[PDB]
Design a protein around this ligand. Sequence first.
Ligand SMILES: O=S([O-])[O-]
Ligand SMILES: [Cl-]
Length: 415
Amino acid sequence: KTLEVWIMPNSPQPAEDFKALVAPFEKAHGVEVKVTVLDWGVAWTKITTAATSGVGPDLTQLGTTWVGAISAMGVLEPVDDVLEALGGEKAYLPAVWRTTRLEGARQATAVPWFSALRAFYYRTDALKAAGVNPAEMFASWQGFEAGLARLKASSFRDPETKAPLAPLCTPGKNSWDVLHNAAPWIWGAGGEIVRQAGGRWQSALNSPESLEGLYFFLSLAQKGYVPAESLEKNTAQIEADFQAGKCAVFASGPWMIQRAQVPEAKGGFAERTAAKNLGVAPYPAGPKGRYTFFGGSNLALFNFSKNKPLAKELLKYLGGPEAQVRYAQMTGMLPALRSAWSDPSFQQNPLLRTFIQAAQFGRTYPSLAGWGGVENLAVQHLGMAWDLVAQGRLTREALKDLMDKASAAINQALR
Ligand SMILES: O=S([O-])[O-]
Ligand SMILES: [Cl-]
């Protein structure tokens, strides 16, 4: 008696980690869980083919931003029942709960599995040497920029590189997460990517507030705070640069905390100066709010499964306390289930405690069926803004004309 699950590579040994996660469930139910690991390069197309053909697994992982699109194809089983048995809506952050359904939909089609959230890592030694107080650097945007000006002026050299640290490392346009990097700034200025008006969704990227947050973020790169080399690279490469002592400050997820403990030999950075001088702070309070970008993944049940009762039991298991703590450990993510945040594995680690403070500002995109195309069209136009930054040519006026073009393309795709 077997269940099939599709996952993406969430942990260092994806298949082995997941088989170890579900071993107590297999024992309690006398069943085998078969897991297939889908590379992020192919997971979407594969899940899409499963949806159209009626051929696929019992359960699939979905990126949180995938929920709307797959739910709208009519192929996912309602899991309102699973979510109630896990404690219902108030068992989750509002931003995580929004990812359980197509936006506006009556029934839940996905169970929260784990959360990817971004906070700022910083070199405690570099801020010390630049005379930057971390509380002030991360309390306002003015403080954030004043902090980067002291880090730019600083004579601090990394003990290993014997070279200056870049004040801020961030990707520009050559990364999968272009929109995610900008989102906190758009939100913090009081804006948003999409808005409801006359009862339908429209681009809000050209709103006054959205443009202010975007220009604030992008102009940091234009003022000398971000290396030109950062703008050509992806998030993984920027991670590597921070580990190798080239960056004072950069946004990433909780997984860096585990990597700081792992030898270079085994793909961690324990021996690097950065590992022993690691601070974390949430994104700084904006003038019109304070927001932490949430992503990560949920689990869903194809309505063609012949094993819905056992699959729902496995959804309750994976979504529930013990597996929530266990898989967060394996993946270096935060549990989707808020009760799992009190586990000693989190509470005994001050860096994880800071990620839990960052979690209270949690915000996600609305779960639109057409979210992919909105994000893709946004990212096309943000990329052109990053090109202007790279030349020192981004003005507020030039940013507005690109986001007006973005907004016309987005509105047509939504209309
Ligand atoms: O360092 S103590 O806060 O875990
Ligand atoms: Cl939004």
